[PDB]
Amino acid sequence: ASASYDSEEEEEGLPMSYDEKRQLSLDINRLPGEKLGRVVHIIQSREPSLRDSNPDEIEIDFETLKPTTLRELERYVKSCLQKKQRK
Amino acid sequence: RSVKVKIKLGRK
């Protein structure tokens, strides 16, 4: 049923691109208030350059931020999609 | 930088 479910032509070896980084911008944008606060802390737990430095507002540096840290958000979102089922 | 991924989660 996999073929009828989707196919997802997804590249794992894509070079640092703004579209690449920005794909994750749209994921964080879809996530609710509870999630944004949580994820931002997980992502920024890696980079010191994290949002900008200021922790009051949330502005994701990902244009200038590393693709390695980019993938952290990917992991999170993939987790959020399958763990949207709360208890 | 160029195309901003600087989110600013528009919750409010």
Side-chain angles (χ1 to χ4, degrees), chain A residues 18 22 28 36 51 58-60 62-63, chain B residues 1-9 11:
Chain A
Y18 300 106
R22 198 152 120 122
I28 176 61
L36 77 92
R51 60 189 69 149
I58 162 169
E59 31 47 272
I60 286 171
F62 263 22
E63 295 174 82
Chain B
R1 175 63 191 199
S2 185
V3 190
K4 316 303 187 67
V5 186
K6 296 283 289 182
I7 194 55
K8 276 156 300 173
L9 231 299
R11 184 181 183 186

Side-chain angles (χ1 to χ4, degrees), chain A residues 36-62 65 69-70 72-73, chain B residues 6-7:
Chain A
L36 77 92
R38 297 179 180 203
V39 60
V40 76
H41 278 247
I42 279 63
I43 316 312
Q44 307 193 155
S45 187
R46 304 178 62 151
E47 287 292 279
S49 314
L50 37 75
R51 60 189 69 149
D52 188 286
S53 288
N54 176 270
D56 185 73
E57 291 291 65
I58 162 169
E59 31 47 272
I60 286 171
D61 183 66
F62 263 22
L65 208 65
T69 317
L70 173 69
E72 186 69 272
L73 178 50
Chain B
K6 296 283 289 182
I7 194 55

Side-chain angles (χ1 to χ4, degrees), chain A residues 3-37:
Chain A
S4 308
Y5 190 72
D6 207 297
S7 300
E8 293 178 75
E9 303 179 272
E10 180 182 274
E11 298 179 69
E12 64 288 79
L14 39 63
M16 65 175 186
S17 308
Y18 300 106
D19 303 297
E20 167 203 44
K21 299 180 174 197
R22 198 152 120 122
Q23 170 191 29
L24 286 299
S25 196
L26 291 308
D27 295 314
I28 176 61
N29 183 87
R30 291 303 307 184
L31 290 166
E34 58 171 79
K35 293 303 192 303
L36 77 92

